[PDB]
Design a protein around this ligand. Structure first.
Ligand code: FE
Ligand code: FE
Ligand code: FE
Ligand code: FE
Ligand code: FE
Ligand code: FE
Ligand code: FE
Ligand code: FE
Ligand code: FE
Ligand code: FE
Ligand code: FE
Ligand code: FE
Ligand code: FE
Ligand code: FE
Ligand code: FE
Ligand code: FE
Ligand code: FE
Ligand code: FE
Ligand code: FE
Ligand code: FE
Ligand code: FE
Ligand code: FE
Ligand code: FE
Ligand code: FE
Ligand code: MG
Ligand code: MG
Ligand code: MG
Ligand code: MG
Ligand code: MG
Ligand code: MG
Lengths: 173, 173, 173, 173, 173, 173
């Protein structure tokens, strides 16, 4: 009884890989934000997201696997061969990636219910929630690029956003 | 004047890659230590090292590059296809990897002096130092595997090692 | 044994002179920033740099000379006969001067290694480090002039930069 | 109305220059006091005076100029080509320089009253006062050289003088 | 890879021996300072230096050897068969010994760079620095013997020097 | 009257020498305990004993000599040419050395009573006491090697022993 679903194991190993690779992409994007686009705080925002992906987002999968019999796989391939043209497009790319995460997570959740893996549906709930929260954070920054033509005004708004004490929303935080 | 050495840029992009990949290998090795070898604290030791490699060890290279004109490259390929047989061999593998780091760093330092990049020789000093410190930490754990046949005695010694307040040595810490 | 290198003495007397004269140039540039360019905080930034050059940068050379047998020379000649046209060009000039310092320091370090003056190579390490740090601080301000067309937005960003508690970077601070 | 006196501007640019150059001379004299005359505290006394001259004494002129329309000039030429023979003569030279300052300041004050620059006469009052205070401090040290033949007794008296909390006199401090 | 240099091992075993023997010489010199020369505080100064040599100066070599594969050797031979004639000559002898240390350390540093032992060049940096610092401390005392003919005035100056809170210099402390 | 016994002077100069040489042997034995025998805490125990011998045990003899007219002699010869085979034998050797100290001290005490040097018999009482205390501390560690076959269990018992607040016994502490 209680034998691990191989399918969920595969999808979560795939989510582990996505989280690792996203984080590494975000670490380059953070560097470029400062280095090339002169936006040090947009860089700090993206670095914080790199650390989330290469941290908690991956941590929980491994912890879960240790508890249920699922196997971890580490197969990582990532190369940043092109960079977006400007800072607005960089945050817009981050956004697109976050939106894709939401679709990937929906699929793990549908699979769990089809496999009757209720422990796995419970586990995915964190990711269903962080999916929307993480998109909301990124969207808030994207908005600024369409709200000002001054990079320093935007930079100061991001700074304040980063230096806020992160009080969680009751449903989404 | 003050034009970046392309060679150092390449060697440090190579060190960035090594640090990223090592960390990802250590994250799998940490998981296996607990999951398969029943050694949760050896796992925490290796997880702490994964975070060092995917954190500060990589952070400083990027920061340096932002200050001098050097370009960051992100090209990462890693797959954990084989796992060591037991826990002693896992820490012994970590050791071998740390020892190699020391040789790689020696090479960046010799290159800097040959290229007359004194800013770069200064920057590598952190890594010349952490090279020995990181090996010393790992060796201290390896020693235990040859000092006891009881995994729980070893586990308790590692626990204490992890929960020590990390007071830095004057030269090496 | 342990007889002072006359060459290093000369190069460091030359660095002492550069630091004194730079500081005096920065004191005029600070005045002009406020007086003519209406940028009081860019003035405070440059005044802080004047004080660094006419303070610690010179202090250590004299202290070193007192410890090793080297002679101090005081021969100072400086006249500010032309002023840059605008504030962006003023910070850009400061930058150029800081970049030159980095080349001068590289030369003292190469000389020390060639003269086998290891005490002197150790002493120059502060200056190899401050060379990059000081350039990084100036570059951060230059960036702003290309990031906004509003002098008051730039001024407010500089203000915050000056009123930050100066937490040192592990390698460069 | 309220148009700056060109004469006062010139005299104060001349006082700025004197203060800069005096400070640089005092910085060498401080070094020599310790290095050659074995009097580290006489060195600290003179270093404190170097910093006063290259600091507040110059700062106020620039601040004043920013408020009234006067132009700052930076033309500095100084070389220490001869050093006094002993420590008594070094402090005696400092004294002579301070006494000259008092005559220079008297001249700015007489000029202000003749030019009806009452703002400028007010501004010079700090310097009329510091002129006597600064001479008094130096005289107190000179006295010691005629009060003892032991350099270490003198050194200890200077030490105490430097480490006093500097409580200002009601008129002169 | 990373195999210890036998030459550095030998030079550092030689520095270990020098530090042990110097400390033992300083312990006798401290005793004589009080016992024969009636200078208890010069004795405390030299005793503090004995403890530095037989402590940290030796400790770090052993610690280093434990980290890199180098072997420690303990072969100590020292006899104090002659004593200096007076106290000035005793501190002058200490000085000469400290000056020699500086030359010995220069040699370890040149050797490291020739052997491409960058870990060893890093390790020697403490000793390149303490070499000058330790000489500076001793020189400060020697100066006093040429600054007064009263042993009690000198003694009181040494006392204050010993009872100072030892605030480190940024480069040399 | 009150003229120093030459015999006691000789025996105490001999005890000074023994204490210096023992400490240096213990410093090597401490290094070997960690380096070769993988017992870092046995190393700390022996290092603490090295410091006792090269510290207080020697300090008091010199202090005594300064008070009574006795002459200090510094003639030290020590070489560690052989090392014990294992850790049990290392602590057993330390023990043998401590036991010998007890016999040497008995002899100084018998001599004092025969020479009617009551000040010297009083002085030796510290050493009669520390002789037994120091043996007791070492015996407590030796016991462990016959109480367990696990080096890590022994190591943990030593650790606790070292990190105890050293509360003195009424007679022996
Ligand atoms: Fe930045
Ligand atoms: Fe967050
Ligand atoms: Fe169903
Ligand atoms: Fe998230
Ligand atoms: Fe667990
Ligand atoms: Fe760590
Ligand atoms: Fe070269
Ligand atoms: Fe590390
Ligand atoms: Fe203002
Ligand atoms: Fe600063
Ligand atoms: Fe050379
Ligand atoms: Fe600086
Ligand atoms: Fe001094
Ligand atoms: Fe003052
Ligand atoms: Fe009038
Ligand atoms: Fe003044
Ligand atoms: Fe005394
Ligand atoms: Fe000290
Ligand atoms: Fe070479
Ligand atoms: Fe020292
Ligand atoms: Fe250790
Ligand atoms: Fe003890
Ligand atoms: Fe009797
Ligand atoms: Fe004892
Ligand atoms: Mg399958
Ligand atoms: Mg290339
Ligand atoms: Mg010359
Ligand atoms: Mg005119
Ligand atoms: Mg050999
Ligand atoms: Mg005799």
């Amino acid at each position: 009884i209680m034998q691990k679903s191989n399918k969920i194991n595969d999808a979560l190993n795939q989510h582990y890989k996505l989280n690792v690779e996203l984080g590494l992409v975000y670490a380059h994007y953070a560097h470029v934000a400062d280095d090339e686009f002169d936006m040090p705080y947009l860089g700090k925002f993206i670095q914080h997201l790199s650390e989330d992906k290469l941290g908690v987002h991956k941590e929980y999968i491994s912890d879960y696997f240790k508890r249920n019999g699922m196997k971890l796989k580490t197969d990582v391939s990532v190369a940043v061969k092109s960079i977006p043209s400007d800072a607005k497009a960089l945050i817009q790319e981050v956004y697109a990636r976050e939106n894709e995460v939401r679709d990937h997570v929906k699929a793990i959740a549908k699979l769990a219910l089809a496999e009757d893996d209720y422990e796995s549906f419970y586990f995915i709930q964190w990711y269903v929630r962080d999916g929307l929260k993480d998109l909301t954070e990124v969207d808030d920054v994207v908005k600024l690029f369409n709200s000002s033509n001054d990079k320093l005004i935007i930079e100061a708004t991001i700074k304040a956003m980063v230096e806020k004490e992160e009080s969680e929303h009751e449903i989404w935080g």
